[PDB]
Amino acid sequence: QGVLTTAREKSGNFPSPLLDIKYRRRQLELRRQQIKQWKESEYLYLQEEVAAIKSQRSEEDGPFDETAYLRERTEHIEREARRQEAEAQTSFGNEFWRRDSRIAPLRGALATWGLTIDDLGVASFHGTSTVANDKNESDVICQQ
């Protein structure tokens, strides 16, 4: 019954907030804003730094293609933005149950699509017609 432990979970008096999709909603769009503002704030920093590297320029140093350097750098903040987005999306929809003592990996994977154990409709069994594998299977999936 090793497989039993994909339903391992110690549940406190109250269900983890995370099981509730709306809480994850909050926290997600919370970080989405938090991210949107970082986005601008970085345009600033990378703006000052543009002009800031012009004044540290010797005449023996090669000129800066602002058009080039500025491109790559915005594009990058854009990427890094999206990156950060999907990443928070990850931590609040996909992987929020990752190693949580208070969420069985079964719960987790299910809840992330807005489902509970009650939505689990069909179980396909190994059920190999052997005496013991069929007791056991039922027993495991049942305890689960």
Binding site: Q1, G2, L4, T5, A7, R8, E9, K10, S101, Q143
Partner: peptide, 29 residues
């Protein structure tokens, strides 16, 4: 774990082993 405990031990992700009187590592009953 004694067989008695097994299902429980499997299902509770906190359950851990305590050193015992005979030096032995066991789960707690």
């Amino acid at each position: 774990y004694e067989d008695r405990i097994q299902s429980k031990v499997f299902l509770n992700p906190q359950s851990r082993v305590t050193q015992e009187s005979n030096g032995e590592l066991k789960f707690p009953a």
